[PDB]
Design a protein around this ligand. Structure first.
Ligand code: IK2
Ligand code: IK2
Lengths: 430, 432
């Protein structure tokens, strides 16, 4: 509607008036990077906030405004901006030496911690991102099976070269990808009958992350596990986001085992990180001593900062117990946010699991990419600008990912700001 | 050359001595195998019987877990330009920690780093950062195919563009399934034929100005002129993979050559030894990523703008490895390589070092090294024996015989390398 469009025009202008120093930064950034941007998700209109500095769960922008960071680096930033244990791991790495050009002890210790944590990961390899992890998992599936077809899901996001958030992106690596509808048992069974013979892999998030914190239904994942086994395709669970949900990620909570699992985000302690692991027999194809071994180099794969900060992250900070506690805290938080919507007759909900959640302006079921897209997009943008005015930073698309540094005062301020949105924007919520 | 029983027995003895010299590294390997395939997470680090595990490093030197010291002539496969403990890198890390980690937003540091990259590289008008050279090359291919609507990519046998674009031994079954045609590196007539056949459907020509992993094999002028002309004529994007070669002068191989690519990929040392890659090039091509554009190309990536890379990278380009420092290091490397080849020639040894500036690789052949075929024809057994010999002399270089001079390599190290080469030639005269 026109009414909402005008509300957004007003909110954008208010943001621009609040943030003229960020505005100047944007005009300069446009000289060296396309649209002043090097990570597409950071861009929003009229321009993005530039931040100056942060400590713990808080940061300040270049205009001086302070915020609680509920975004947490799209789930990588589990430790806040200045964790002393992470800092210590960085100091220990610098003492060991940088760019050591050789095999290290720390990479093996980190690997042991990873294999110990995740119940379907017998052996693991590190990459430099979730994008690389997923690409290597597809390389594995395709090379082993000799097949070309990959089943993935509309709304699915698996990195820079495997972006299905708005269907097929023209920039995707040219794997022969067939897209199903997330959570659609009937349609997906049909696609598997059609393509099962030629399917190298099923690639799926146990909860759409970038696609809107949409949990996978049990019946959907059971279909995928059964059919992958029947047709000889590798089931790949992309847990780059979902691994945080318990000590052993979504697979532990589900009792469903993927053939390969990809990891990313928080696991390297906030340093560059990705990983792919899985069944021993599949991963041994990368043993470089073995006959016709697959090649997987990568300059920074075993870099000392990631290996050292990650080992600290898993063993000292985000233990199995910390994962259970944060996820339970996240469940209570999301229920409280939904109670606020319910008690105020608000046409919104928050979907997700554990410490992950996203607002959707609909009271209908949010089960697939279609549902997320059909929910009100103008109200979502308005909500972002409102939260900023309340000193709460979350994703433009309405996602939060609670760090370990988020405390009672932070959660309370978020919940109060949500109530304020509902009251202040009542006219637009009818 | 062909394998012989004589050389095999020499190699088996060198491996046995290495195993005996390094029992702690051997135990590490056995443990590592329990959690990573063959105890490995980066294929290039593995060699038989097992790799050395190092304990610590300072400057240009390091020590392994059995207590041996070496000077590091490998330099992290060209990423380790600053040594193991550069004070300016360390200061950049400290500044980064003080700003804040994982800040979840844009910072100024990324714009300042992007400006330093654009200042530095003469054909890069706009740039985007990735987390590796592998990602940089994939995004450059993504850009070319999406802009052109075409499927075919011309690359070269012996070429290496990252984990999903490995042509070092021809087509790898793990490669991302771009429709890649492989040419012979430096083959003008053969490549002209391929471009005649495929040119109309060519999204991109992807080429290193010098084969890196493929053997430090310089591209010849006539070869690159052909690629530049035919890319323009066909409407293909010429992509120069300068992940390794960018170091060779202030403005990489493109400044040396006076040839401009449509896109250039970057990696290795530019992020100050932190995770890093980048792709950039012509303004009109890179603007397709402006997120304010309708139909903007998407390119997220959790760590693309991470504070450690942004901060150490800006320091690397503006404070440490300036354009003059690049010229100076390349001149130092050119004199080094010439000295090594002089030592070969004077002893009438069947070996040469190929490369440019501070990068070089030994090849056990008297033939011109111009393509992957030439590299593969050279004696591979002697290359293995060379590796173990150099280790015994306290010199660490790649198993495949590559050195990449860091800023921390001084006269003593270069002298020791040259002396160790002479000792190899003398001690292994029978097999040469
Ligand atoms: C499920 C999933 N798989 C894979 C990925 C890809 O991981 P990475 O961005 O480390 O390549 C991501 C997240 N990518 O986030 C982009 C950003 O924050 O800029 C992801 O959420
Ligand atoms: C010319 C070129 N392009 C691209 C690449 C790929 O760059 P990256 O390893 O950062 O993905 C590399 C080197 N990759 O080195 C492997 C390793 O040291 O483990 C490269 O040399």
């Amino acid at each position: 509607t026109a009414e909402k469009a005008q509300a957004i025009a007003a909110a954008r202008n208010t943001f621009a008036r609040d943030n003229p120093v960020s505005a100047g930064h944007h005009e300069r950034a446009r000289r060296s990077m396309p649209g002043g941007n090097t990570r597409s998700i950071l861009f929003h209109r009229p321009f993005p906030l530039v931040i100056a500095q942060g400590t713990g769960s808080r940061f300040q922008d270049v205009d001086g405004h302070a915020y609680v960071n509920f975004l947490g680096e799209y789930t990588a930033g589990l430790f806040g901006h200045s964790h002393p244990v992470i800092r210590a791991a960085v100091e220990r790495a610098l003492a060991v030496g940088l760019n050591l050009s050789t095999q290290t002890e720390n990479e093996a210790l980190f690997a042991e911690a990873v294999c110990d944590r995740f119940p379907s990961i017998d052996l693991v390899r590190f990459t430099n991102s979730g994008t690389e992890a997923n690409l290597m998992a597809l390389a594995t599936a395709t090379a082993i099976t000799g097949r070309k077809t990959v089943l993935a899901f509309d709304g699915g996001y698996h990195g820079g070269l495997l972006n299905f958030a708005s269907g097929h992106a023209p920039t995707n690596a040219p794997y022969h990808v067939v897209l199903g509808v997330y959570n659609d048992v009937e349609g997906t069974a049909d696609l598997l009958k059609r393509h099962g013979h030629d399917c190298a892999a099923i690639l799926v998030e146990p909860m759409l992350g970038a696609g809107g914190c949409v949990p996978a239904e049990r019946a959907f994942l059971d279909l995928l596990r059964a059919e992958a086994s029947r047709c000889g395709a590798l089931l790949i669970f992309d847990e780059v986001m979902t691994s945080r949900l318990s000590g052993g990620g979504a697979q532990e909570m589900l009792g469903i085992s993927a053939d390969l699992t990809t990891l990313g985000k928080y696991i390297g302690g906030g340093m560059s990180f990705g990983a792919f692991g899985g069944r021993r027999d599949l991963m041994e194809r990368f043993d470089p001593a073995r006959d016709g071994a697959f090649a997987h180099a990568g300059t920074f794969n075993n870099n000392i900062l990631t290996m050292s900060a990650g080992h600290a992250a898993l063993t000292q900070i985000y233990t199995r117990q910390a994962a259970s506690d944060l996820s339970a805290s996240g469940d209570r938080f999301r229920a409280n946010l939904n109670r606020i919507a319910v008690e105020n007759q608000a046409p919104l909900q928050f979907t997700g699991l554990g410490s992950l959640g996203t607002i959707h302006f609909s009271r209908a079921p949010i089960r697939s990419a279609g549902d997320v897209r059909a929910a009100d997009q103008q109200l979502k943008e308005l909500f972002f600008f409102h939260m900023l005015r309340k000193g709460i930073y979350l994703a433009p698309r309405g996602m939060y990912a609670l760090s370990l540094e988020i405390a009672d005062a932070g959660r309370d301020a978020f919940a109060e700001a949500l109530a304020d949105f509902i009251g202040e924007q009542r006219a637009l919520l009818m």
